Amino acid sequence: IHPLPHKIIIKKRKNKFIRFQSERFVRVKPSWRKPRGIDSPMRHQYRGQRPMVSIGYGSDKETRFMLPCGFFKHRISTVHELKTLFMNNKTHAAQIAHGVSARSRKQILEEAKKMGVRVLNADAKL
């Protein structure tokens, strides 16, 4: 139920990178795009514009993809997949895929309790 001690997690930017001018028009969605206009101020990166995406923001290779609880994620749908991905571990906790019924989450949960695996959606459907 606990992972091994790790380095301190740093996020270099806390908010999301939002598409330029998506706040003016409903038809323009907030998903990121690269500015590519000849007169674009966002492309020229004048002061006071939104920040631009670049690989300098990437995360520390030892902590990238690590959830706040300290574990890395594994996504499973059956009891067979519970055992195969967790023979060797202590780096991963497990997650039940959303489509798994309430009848079979009891079988996965109790079985995974014996193996000594954390499940991250233990108390979804009562």
The site for another protein (CB under 8 A) is made up of 2-10, 47, 70
Binding mask 34-53 for RNA (x = CB under 7 A): -xxxxxxx-xxxxxxxxx-x
Residue 17 sits in the site that holds RNA (CB under 7 A): yes
User: Are 102 and 108 spatial neighbours (Cβ–Cβ below 8 Å)?
Assistant: no
AA letter at 106: K
Binding mask 86-105 for RNA (x = CB under 7 A): ---------xxxxxxxxxx-
Of K ion, another protein, RNA, none, which one sits near residue 6, judging by CB under 5 to 8 A according to partner kind?
A: another protein
C-alpha distances out from residue 53 to 21, 39, 75, 87, Å: 16, 19, 29, 39
Residue 38 sits in the site that holds K ion (CB under 5 A): yes
Q: Could you say which of 22, 40, 89, 121 contacts K ion (CB under 5 A)?
A: 22
C-alpha distances out from residue 78 to 81, 84, 94, 103, 117, Å: 5, 10, 11, 12, 14
